[PDB]
From a paper:
The sigma-1 receptor (σ1R) is a non-opioid transmembrane receptor which has been implicated in many diseases, including neurodegenerative disorders and cancer. The sigma-1 receptor (σ1R) is a small, unique integral membrane receptor that is localized primarily in the endoplasmic reticulum (ER). σ1R responds to a structurally diverse array of synthetic ligands such as (+)-pentazocine (agonist) and haloperidol (antagonist). Published structures of human σ1R reveal its homotrimeric organization of a cupin-fold β-barrel body that contains the ligand binding site, a carboxy-terminal V-shaped two-helix bundle, and a single amino-terminal transmembrane helix, while simulation studies have suggested a ligand entry pathway that is generated by conformational rearrangements of the cupin-fold domain. Here, we present multiple crystal structures, including an open-like conformation, of σ1R from Xenopus laevis. Together with functional binding analysis our data suggest that access to the σ1R ligand binding site is likely achieved by protein conformational changes that involve the carboxy-terminal two-helix bundle, rather than structural changes in the cupin-fold domain.
In our continued search for an open structure of xlσ1R, crystals with an appearance (cube-like) different from the xlσ1Rclosed-endo crystals (cuboid-like) were obtained and their structure was determined to 3.56 Å (xlσ1Ropen-endo). The xlσ1Ropen-endo structure was solved in the P212121 space group, with each asymmetric unit containing 12 protomers. Similar to all σ1R structures, xlσ1Ropen-endo also assembles as homotrimers. Each asymmetric unit contains four trimers, which are packed in a tetrahedron shape through the α1–α1 contacts. Structural comparison between xlσ1Ropen-endo and xlσ1Rclosed-endo shows that the two structures are very similar, with the exception of two regions. One region consists of the transmembrane helix α1, which swings ~18° away from the trimer center in xlσ1Ropen-endo compared to xlσ1Rclosed-endo. In xlσ1Ropen-endo, the α4 helix rotates slightly away from α5, and the side chain of Tyr203 from α5 adopts a gauche+ χ1 rotamer to point to the cupin-fold domain, thus creating an opening between α4 and α5 that generates a direct pathway for the ligand from the outside milieu to the ligand-binding site. Therefore, the xlσ1Ropen-endo structure may represent an open-like conformation for σ1R and is consistent with PATH2 that predicts the ligand entry between α4 and α5. Like xlσ1Rclosed-endo, the xlσ1Ropen-endo crystals were grown in the absence of any known ligand, but the xlσ1Ropen-endo structure also has an unidentifiable electron density within its ligand-binding pocket.
Author numbering:
A (entry chain A), B (entry chain B), C (entry chain C): -3 to 219
């Protein structure tokens, strides 16, 4: 039974590889055939439309428009708060409006000069600048590009770049894909640098509120 | 007998929260009751007095004045050394003059442009700029404020901000509260980023020196 | 057996100290008597010679000259790729040309504004600027210095500094000493911040390619 004791070892690894491949293909097929509440072009155009005003007025108008076109998918004013985001070596702030297992919409930006690693996840993230500047340094190149209000950067799936923002840079962010892949990145600098677990609690609270809102909307649609 | 299973846990958690509340009340009352070697106004005025001259001359004059007004509570010239401080995503350097379990005084600053998370501890930290600029971004806002020589930033207890310092920014720092709460923060980037454990040794050394000086001064004053 | 058991601990600790000291002395004596493919002056002069041109033209000419003078010790064009480097709180990009256990040559630089801790390892690292600016802040001082194309920074063994690079700063890097000492540093920010394990894989790939090239060259010299 020495040959069969080794047959288990060989076949168990093949089974693990086949199961992981089947799970990845299943998730990819689900993501390709799923119905989405928002599309990235919608958010990008809505942001470019109000990018000419003050970024706070733009925030207000964009939130109003999002609640009008997609009722039941955006948090109310009593649940909106700015939460610090320390990640990839940079530090900014977010205001989450919607978040599911496959989509999230928020208002991002920083009042200080920061920059770092953009992350590399199984999701596509679009960023439309309302004010400020956004320097992107794509992988495998020696030159970066600066983007201004109105522009939209698309951090593609599986791509990793370097991001840099000047003081007062604010944008509207929409992420689509497998959102939990980002989660770990979003927490790294909080665990091994800032030690700001209170901000971690705030982040957990707002994400939980968005997920519960989406679940309650699904239940209301069913009854 | 099944009801007691969950009754053990349910009231026990309230008792645990009450016990930590009693510990917090004891520590909070001890801080107000405690007599303090320094007050933030004293350090702030002493630093602002010399904020108009060169930052090195200001360092020397402030150290001499502190040794004059509080003998036995400030390290001698043989114990002063600049130690790198990597924390919260920023990098500066410190020279510790005094440190107890509830107070610390030091000269902080950086010769490079840095910035990051300010930390969130159970202590109030006052910073009086001797030279340079200090950008502070408070939590929950979208705009930051720049402070110049003469100004004083008060990192309040439990609040977290974003700090940014330009090249050649130097200040006098006084912290009061529960000092060990900051400790972990002060080491995070050293453990998970810089790997400069020699600087960790230097920091532990100066902290131990200050604590031993404070203990010996207490023993000498008591007898 | 109290007297005997305390005897165990003392001799055990002395044995550990003596063994670690003998290992360190062995490695240092080996490093002092080893033949090296490159010297820092060679790389520094070769980079300063082409420091007047564009950093890409300089890269190509320097690679050509290095492959001409030292054939079989530098990877070919099919193995060269730019890999992101997140370390010490800064983010740049590298292109490795040569790497052994005691030497490494690469082209380093960043297209974004970054800076942080320089690291502290058992190796000397020379950096000859082809373009941009390099701000160095030495340990124990309150002033930094800016260096321009043509200059050479020598990150000495055991010294720790603060580095800062402007957008578009590119240089040629040569490191000599005990290379594994740097290893932890090179991965720290990747494990506890970026979570970009694909870039980790790329780094491992290029390091393995350079090491295998060196091993195959030694075998070819032997036969």
């Amino acid at each position: 039974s020495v040959d069969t004791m080794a047959l288990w070892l060989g076949l168990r690894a093949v089974l693990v590889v086949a199961g992981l491949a089947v799970l990845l293909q299943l998730i990819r097929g689900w993501l390709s055939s799923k119905s989405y509440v928002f599309n990235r072009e919608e958010i990008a155009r809505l942001a470019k439309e109000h990018s000419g005003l003050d970024y706070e007025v733009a925030f207000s108008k964009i939130i109003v428009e999002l609640r009008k076109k997609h009722p039941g998918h955006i948090l109310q004013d009593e649940d909106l708060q700015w939460v610090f985001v320390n990640a990839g070596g940079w530090m900014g702030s977010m205001c989450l409006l919607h978040a599911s297992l496959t989509e999230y919409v928020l208002l991002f930006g920083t009042a200080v000069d920061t920059g770092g690693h953009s992350g590399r996840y199984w999701a596509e993230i679009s960023d439309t600048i309302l004010s400020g500047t956004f320097r992107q340094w794509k992988e495998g190149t020696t030159k970066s590009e600066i983007f201004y209000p109105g522009d939209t950067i698309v951090h593609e799936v599986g791509e990793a770049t370097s991001v840099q923002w000047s003081s007062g840079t604010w944008m509207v962010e929409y992420g689509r894909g497998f959102i939990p892949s980002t989660l770990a990145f979003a927490l790294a600098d909080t665990i091994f640098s800032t030690q700001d677990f209170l901000t971690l609690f705030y982040t957990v609270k707002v994400y939980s509120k968005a997920l519960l809102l989406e679940a309650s909307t699904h239940l209301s649609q069913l009854g």
